[PDB]
Design a protein around this ligand. Sequence first.
Ligand code: HEM
Ligand code: HEM
Ligand SMILES: CN(C)Cc1cccc(NCc2ccc3ccc(N)nc3c2)c1
Ligand SMILES: CN(C)Cc1cccc(NCc2ccc3ccc(N)nc3c2)c1
Ligand SMILES: C[C@H](O)[C@H](O)[C@H]1CNc2nc(N)[nH]c(=O)c2N1
Ligand SMILES: C[C@H](O)[C@H](O)[C@H]1CNc2nc(N)[nH]c(=O)c2N1
Ligand SMILES: [Zn+2]
Lengths: 410, 404
Amino acid sequence: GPKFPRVKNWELGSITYDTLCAQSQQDGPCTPRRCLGSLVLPRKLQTPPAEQLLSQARDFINQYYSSIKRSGSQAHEERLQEVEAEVASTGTYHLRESELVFGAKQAWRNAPRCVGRIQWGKLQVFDARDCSSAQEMFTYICNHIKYATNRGNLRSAITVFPQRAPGRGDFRIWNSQLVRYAGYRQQDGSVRGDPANVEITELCIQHGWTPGNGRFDVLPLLLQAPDEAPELFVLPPELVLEVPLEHPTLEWFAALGLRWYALPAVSNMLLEIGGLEFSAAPFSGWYMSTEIGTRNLCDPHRYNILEDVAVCMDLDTRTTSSLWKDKAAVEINLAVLHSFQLAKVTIVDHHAATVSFMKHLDNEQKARGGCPADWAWIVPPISGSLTPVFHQEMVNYILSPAFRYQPDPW
Amino acid sequence: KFPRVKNWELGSITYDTLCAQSQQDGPCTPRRCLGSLVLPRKPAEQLLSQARDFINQYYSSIKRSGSQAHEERLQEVEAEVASTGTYHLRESELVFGAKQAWRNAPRCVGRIQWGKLQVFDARDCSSAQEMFTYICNHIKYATNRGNLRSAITVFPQRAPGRGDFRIWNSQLVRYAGYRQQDGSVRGDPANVEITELCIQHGWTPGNGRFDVLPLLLQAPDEAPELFVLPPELVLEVPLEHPTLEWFAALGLRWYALPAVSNMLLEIGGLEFSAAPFSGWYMSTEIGTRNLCDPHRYNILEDVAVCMDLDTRTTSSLWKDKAAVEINLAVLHSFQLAKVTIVDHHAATVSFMKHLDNEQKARGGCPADWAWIVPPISGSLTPVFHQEMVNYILSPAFRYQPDPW
Ligand code: HEM
Ligand code: HEM
Ligand SMILES: CN(C)Cc1cccc(NCc2ccc3ccc(N)nc3c2)c1
Ligand SMILES: CN(C)Cc1cccc(NCc2ccc3ccc(N)nc3c2)c1
Ligand SMILES: C[C@H](O)[C@H](O)[C@H]1CNc2nc(N)[nH]c(=O)c2N1
Ligand SMILES: C[C@H](O)[C@H](O)[C@H]1CNc2nc(N)[nH]c(=O)c2N1
Ligand SMILES: [Zn+2]
C-alpha cells in the first residue's frame, strides 16, 4: 500500500511502515546495486559554507521548536532570524543550553547501532562549553566519571566540550574510551593486555607515560586542548570502579584473575547538532553483558580466553562439534552477569536489553513513525535468534543530530 | 567505487569488483538500507540480453569463448526468441546454470560445495504424477541411506499464457501443523496453511507433532494433486543427548533431507517455477531455529525445566544453556545415525575458505551477513568478523508468490 518501507516481525506476524526514513538528509553506503550494511566503517560513514550550515541549523531549530510544540511561533521565527544573523556575522552560531540538551538526547535517540535507546530520554547533559584547558577537561571528565559511576548505580551522561571553531584547534580526547586497558606488544609478537589498545598504549608511552606490564593496566587519558600538544592525565584509581569476575558454580573461575571496568564511556566520537561539531563529547551508559563476556573477553583479536575457559571446563577442544566454544562462552557471560550483580554494579543481559529495545521500537513507531536500526549491531553476538530482535526486520538510515565517527587526531 | 571489504579479526582487506556484474537491483538506496528484510517488497530485447549474457557465461566457463560453437549458439538463441518470444536451454547449459545459481546465492553458507551438485533434467514432464516420480527419485538419490548428496530436479520452465508447474509445499519434507481452536498449534506452526490446503484436497490428517505432510503437485492450469510420500523414502533422526538421558523422553525428531521446493530458478531470463533442491542440514537450522524459535516448536522452556534451570529470570541465561544442549543433541543424534550434518563452526570455516576461493576466481562473493552468521554463537564464528557485500547475480534462485 503506502510508499514507505514495509517492516515485518516474523515472530509476531505484525507489520509496520517506516515513514521517519523520509526525514533522512544524509546518504548511507548502500545503492540499488549492492548493500554495504555489514561494513563497520564505509566511506559514507566517515567525516563550512554558510548555506550548508544554515540549512542544517534551520533544520535543527525546526526540530527543537517541534519538540516543544512551538512550530510557527514568533519565538521560533526569532530564533531562526537570530541564527541567520550569527552565521552572517561570525561564520558559525551557538546553541542555547536547552537546545544542546535536546540535541544530545536526539543524537542518542538517533543512533542506529545502540540497543539501549529505551533510556534515551534519561541522559544527564553536562555543559562543558566553557572549558579552556586540558587540565580543565580532566576535571570535567573526573566529575563525569564520579556522577555516572555513582558507586555502581550507573547513570547515563554526556559531557559536551566546546564546538569546532573556524581557524582554531579542536578539543579532542585521544583515547577511544575513558577507561581502557593497556596493550603491550611483546618481543615475541604477542600482546599482553587488550590488543585493541596497542596503538593508544604506545602513544601514551611516546607522550611520557611510564608503562606497566599487567593484563589489566588502566590507561592514562591523553587530552588535547586547541592547538596544543595532548597532555597526560592519570585517573585516580579510586575513581575507576572495576568488577572482579567469578562464576556462580564453577569455583575455579575466580582464580583466572579476570575483571572488567564498570563504566563504558565512549570518548572519540563526534557529536553533530545543527551543523555544529562537538569533537570532544564523551558519553557513558552501562554495559550489556555480551559486550564484556562475548566480545571483549572472547573475540580472537581481544583477550581471547575461550580456549583457556574451555580447558578449565574439561571440554573437547580438538573438535568443533563438541560445541566447546558455545559452552565456554555461555559460562563466561554468566560470570559477567553474576559478578556485576554481586558487586551491585548496573549491567543488563542481552535478553533483557533486546526486550526493552522492542518496547523502544513500539514507542518510536508511534512517536516518529519509525526507528533507524542497524540489525547487525542490534542482534547480540551470542544467542542471536533467542532474542526478539533477530525476528524483527529493521530499516537503517542517518538522522541528525548524530554521533559520528571521526578520524584519529594523530 | 568498488567496496573495500575488511576482516576485523585478521586485518585483511579485499575489493569486491564482482558486484559490477550485477544487473539486478536490491532493496537498498542511499537514503535507507533494507538489508535485513526477508522478502522483496514486490519483454523481448530484455530476454535476449539476459540470454546472450548467460550463453557468454557458459562458453567462458568451458574455455571456448569466441568459438564457432559459441557464435552459432547465440544465433540459435536469438532466432528462437525473435520467432517465438522464448528459447530453450541445452542440458549442459542447464547443469551449468543450476550450479551458478547456487554459487550466486548470497544467503547460503554451504557454497563451498557449489561445484558438486547432481542435476536432474525433468523438463520432459507433463503431469503431476510424473512430477511425483521425479521427486521420489530425487529424494532417494539425495538421501543415499544417510550419506547425503546435493541435488536439484528441474521441471519445465514457465511459458507465456500458460499456468506454472509448481510444488505447493515449501520443502519436500515438512511436518504438519494443526490449528487448535483454543488458539494453539500442534506440530509445526510454520506449516498451518499448507496443512490446511492438504486437508481440503482430501488428505486424511494425523494428530501428532511430527506428521510428515503429503505433497501437493500442480501441472499447468490444473488443480494440484495430493501424493503421500512412501515412509521408507523419508529418513528421520530421533533426537537424544549424549549425557542428559531424559532428552530422548522429549520425543523429538527431525528429518534428514533439507529440500527447498518453492523457490524459482532463473537462468538466462528463463524461469523454472518448480526446481526443488537439497543439500544437508547445518545443525543450527534444526537445533536453534526449527526447535527453539518462539513461532516454531518453541521447546526452550521444556528443555530448561528438565535441566532444572532458573526460568524466573533472563540473567540466569537459561535460554542460552538450553539452546546449546539442544544443538549438541542434534549433532550427536545425526552423528549416531550416520546422517550427514555440519555444525555451525565447521560450516562458517568452510565458507571463509569459499570467500577466499571466490575472491581469486571472480573478484568477490555476494554474501548476506544476517543469514551467513549463525543464529547462536555469532561472534564465535569467523564470518561474524568478516565484512560482506550483498548483490544479485544471475543465474539466481528467487522467491515467487504462493500458487494459491
Ligand atoms: C544506558 C545503557 C546503554 C546500553 C545498554 C547501550 C548499549 C549499546 C550496545 C550494546 C552497543 C553496541 C556496542 C558495541 O558492540 O561496541 C551500543 C552502541 C552505541 N551506543 Fe549505546 N548503550 C547505552 C547508553 C548509551 C548512551 C548514553 C549513548 C549516547 C548518549 C549511547 C550511544 C551509542 C552509540 C552512538 C553507539 C554506536 C557506536 C558505534 O557505532 O561504534 N549509548 N550501545
Ligand atoms: C550442501 C550442503 C548445504 C548447506 C550446509 C547449506 C546451508 C544453508 C543454510 C544454513 C542456509 C540458511 C537457510 C535458513 O536459515 O533457512 C542456506 C540457504 C540457502 N541455500 Fe544452502 N546449503 C547447502 C546446499 C544448498 C544447495 C544444494 C542449494 C541449491 C542448489 C542451496 C541454496 C540455498 C539458497 C537459495 C538459500 C537461501 C534460501 C532462502 O532465501 O530462503 N544450498 N543454506
Ligand atoms: C571507536 N569509538 C566509536 C569508541 C569505541 C571504543 C570501543 C568500543 C565502542 N563501542 C561502541 C559503543 C558506543 C556506545 C556504547 C554505549 C553503551 C555501551 N554499553 N556500549 C557502547 C559501545 C566504541
Ligand atoms: C520459504 N521458502 C524459501 C522455502 C523454505 C522453506 C523452509 C525453509 C527454508 N529455508 C531456506 C533454505 C534454503 C536452502 C537450504 C539449503 C540447505 C540447507 N541446509 N538449508 C536451506 C534452507 C526455505
Ligand atoms: C563485520 C561486522 O560488521 C562486524 O564484525 C560487526 C558486526 N556487528 C557488531 N555488533 C555490535 N554490537 N558491535 C560490533 O562491534 C559489531 N561488529
Ligand atoms: C528479520 C531477519 O532478517 C530474519 O529474522 C532473518 C535473519 N537471519 C536469518 N538467517 C538465516 N540463516 N535464516 C533466516 O531465516 C534468517 N532470518
Ligand atoms: Zn543495505
